[PDB]
């Protein structure tokens, strides 16, 4: 029991909670995000997460194979998940590159983001403590934008390719290569440290944040909604796809996570515990972030919505600020970023392993030939690093933001989750699936899961998509910038490169299989034993 609970606590939290959720919540205006978020956590989210584990357990096979047994026509969902994981793994590691750079820069007697005597700083600087007495900029924000990020005036201006962050990406990819090649993962007594350190750090940071002199305004911003004005189309896709990204459902790795488990287990209770713990830790760390932002606003005299960047940088603006104000700042900075790198790697390893297993299962005859595995992992890492280089240029932030919005989140997750629930509920049959679940776990899904698959998840995933297209607004990075049309075309190119895998495989199989049209449709709709 104890070891299982510890594994449950440690294995499923990740950067989706500590980094992604805060900046989406801040970008959509605080508390207005929590309403559509909890409307997607139940009636979708948790019922889809259970369905994902059950599919993997039921097939005893990866993402590519299970849909062959459930519904051959929709086998393309496996390739959709695999390509989503690929586009994710390309960009997800750049966060660890930034974290590693912060870790290296933390090795100083005085943190570089504490004061702006340093060379990279604009003359418009004002030390945060003196700013309360214009264009004044805080040292942390411009450190992030000019030393770490070296942000160029747009995606149209890639500029130079930063050697330091390229070294960081190479370092992290080398770690991943050697770990997955050797099969290294935290399983030993080191688990008691690895799985608990993130929660220790988050509790310490929450204590630091709430004790700040400006926490109350931050929490009031964080929890008081704007129900009458915030309901644009963006917030609804952001909220739903935050659940689906955080749970890593449509990525297909959870099919592997379930297939590895013993079948004779109460998968229902385990899935409800995991999904509630993940959503709870996200919601709890929200307090630390937004209390720190309330302190930043109180200490500078600007509205909370304006204190920090609304893009990916929110965590790397907020936590450095908090760690600047604790005894021996360097110690806690080092601890924070080591914790962040551990929390990131424990996810990166799982995603890479899932991708490698899926791709070798898609072509075992060549990939399974002994050293073929070791060579193939190196190939995948090399290609991923060569793509990641683009997000390391002076214009790299804009490409990273474009990936983070279109490539592995947004409307494509809603596409894949709609088709999963539609297939199982209406094509395969909720009745058949309930009988299968009775066989596996001993009791049927019940009404909440049954109707969540039949009606609620289809309805939500169609409504958010149609609403997005009916009231369409483009991407912006930090709210003053605008992406050019070619960048928005590239974003849709990624999203569609994920989404189209369903129609393409449907038509391919309808054409590749002999017989009359309806005969082929029946042959490919019917399950396999």
């Amino acid at each position: 029991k104890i070891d299982f609970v510890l594994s449950v606590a440690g294995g499923f939290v990740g950067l989706g909670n500590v980094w992604r959720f805060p900046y989406l919540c801040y970008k959509n205006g605080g508390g207005a995000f929590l309403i559509p978020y909890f409307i997607f956590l139940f009636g979708s989210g948790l019922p889809v997460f259970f369905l994902e584990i059950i599919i993997g357990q039921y097939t005893s096979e990866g993402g590519i194979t299970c849909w062959e047994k459930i519904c051959p026509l929709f086998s393309g969902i496996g390739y959709a998940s695999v390509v989503i994981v690929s586009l994710l793994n390309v960009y997800y590691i750049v966060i660890l590159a930034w974290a590693t750079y912060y870790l290296f820069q933390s090795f100083q007697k005085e943190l570089p983001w504490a004061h702006c005597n340093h060379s990279w700083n604009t003359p418009h600087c004002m030390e945060d403590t003196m700013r309360k007495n214009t264009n004044f900029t805080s040292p942390v924000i411009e450190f992030w934008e000019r030393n770490v990020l070296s942000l160029s005036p747009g995606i149209d201006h890639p500029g130079s390719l930063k050697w330091d962050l390229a070294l960081c990406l190479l370092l992290v990819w080398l770690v991943c290569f050697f770990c997955i090649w050797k099969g290294v993962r935290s399983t030993g007594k080191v688990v008691y440290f690895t799985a608990t350190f993130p929660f220790a750090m988050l509790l310490v940071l929450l204590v630091r944040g709430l004790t700040l002199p400006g926490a109350g305004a931050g929490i009031k911003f964080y929890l008081y909604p704007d129900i009458t004005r915030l309901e644009d189309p963006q917030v609804w896709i952001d909220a739903g796809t935050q659940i689906f990204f955080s749970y890593a459902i449509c990525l297909g790795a959870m099919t592997s996570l379930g297939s590895y488990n013993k079948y004779h287990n109460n998968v229902y209770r385990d899935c409800m515990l995991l999904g509630c713990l993940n959503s709870g830790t996200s919601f709890v760390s929200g307090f630390a972030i937004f209390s720190i932002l309330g302190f930043m606003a109180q200490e500078q005299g600007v509205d909370i919505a304006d204190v920090a960047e609304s893009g990916p940088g929110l965590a790397f603006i907020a936590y450095p600020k908090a760690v600047t104000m604790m005894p021996l700042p360097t110690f806690w900075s080092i601890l924070f970023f080591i914790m962040l790198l551990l929390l990131g790697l424990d996810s990166q390893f799982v995603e890479v392993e899932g991708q490698i297993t899926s791709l070798v299962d898609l072509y075992p005859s060549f990939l399974r030939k002994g050293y073929r595995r070791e060579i193939f992992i190196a190939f995948v890492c090399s290609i991923s690093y060569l793509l990641g280089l683009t997000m390391v240029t002076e214009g790299g932030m804009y490409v990273f933001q474009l990936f983070d919005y279109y490539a592995a989140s947004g409307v494509c997750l809603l596409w894949v989750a709609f088709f999963e629930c539609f297939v199982i509920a209406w094509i395969y049959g909720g009745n058949r699936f309930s009988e299968d679940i009775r066989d596996m776990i001993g009791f049927p899904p019940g009404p909440w899961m049954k109707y969540s698959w039949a009606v609620i998840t289809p309805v939500l995933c169609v409504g958010c998509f149609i609403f997005s297209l009916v009231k369409y607004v483009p991407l912006t990075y930090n709210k003053t910038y605008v992406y050019p049309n070619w960048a928005i075309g590239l974003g849709w190119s990624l999203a569609l490169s994920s989404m189209l895998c369903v129609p393409l495989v449907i038509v391919i199989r309808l054409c590749q299989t002999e017989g009359p049209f309806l005969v082929r449709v029946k042959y490919l709709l019917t399950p396999r034993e």
Partner: antibody, heavy 118, light 107 residues
């Protein structure tokens, strides 16, 4: 969920064949797994066979693995147990028992019907 | 087959006394997958206890159960004349399903 009623008990020669029926009422018979449980003259219960709610999954006790075939009629709300070759040890009183939730046991039992061979 | 056996094959009893019965299995089974049934003489069995401690809808509160792993039990806080019946422990963790030998309260 209220009622279950077995039928078809009686006497049949050893090595013969016989088929039992178990009617159901008061619940959606097409959505609950059903089981047959056998009580010997020594009052000892034994399990016979299970059919899942949809009839796709079927399990048999080893002692009848090849002798008995279980089936159901969802439209008629009737459960069937067919015996192809009765051994002398098959005489008992047969109960059909509703068993959808394995974590919740056999919630309901029919009146039961005796079966004998000589 | 995971054979189940109950130790006290038959028990004499009088009103008001405390009474308990034991179930043991050839192989350990999860707590959730073990149940107890009551059969009155000349009548069909009825579910009495499920998931090893949960009480059925018609059972007096004086019944109770506990156990884990390979051995399980139920106990009566204080018997009454209406409790005279045979009780079977039954595992539900894996086929073939098996019922215990059954134990009867004779008075």
């Amino acid at each position: 969920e209220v009622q279950l009623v077995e039928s078809g008990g009686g006497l049949v020669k050893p090595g013969g064949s016989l088929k039992l029926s178990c009617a159901a009422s008061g619940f959606t018979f097409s959505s609950y797994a059903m089981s047959w449980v056998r009580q010997s003259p020594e009052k000892r219960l034994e399990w016979v066979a299970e059919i899942s709610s949809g009839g796709r999954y079927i399990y048999y006790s080893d002692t009848v693995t090849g002798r008995f075939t279980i089936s159901r009629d969802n439209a008629r709300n009737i459960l069937h147990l067919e015996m192809s070759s009765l051994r002398s040890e098959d005489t008992a009183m047969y109960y059909c028992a509703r068993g959808e939730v394995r974590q919740r046991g056999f919630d309901y039992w029919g009146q039961g019907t005796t079966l004998t061979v000589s | 087959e995971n054979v189940l056996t109950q130790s006290p094959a038959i028990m004499s009893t009088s009103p008001g006394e405390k009474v308990t019965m034991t179930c043991r299995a050839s192989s350990s089974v999860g707590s959730s997958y073990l149940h107890w049934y009551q059969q009155k003489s000349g009548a069909s069995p009825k579910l009495w206890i499920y998931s090893t401690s949960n009480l059925a809808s018609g059972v007096p509160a004086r019944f109770s159960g506990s156990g884990s792993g390979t051995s399980y039990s139920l106990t009566i806080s204080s018997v009454e004349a209406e409790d005279a019946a045979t009780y079977y422990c039954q595992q539900f963790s894996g086929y073939p399903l098996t019922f215990g030998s059954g134990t009867k309260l004779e008075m």
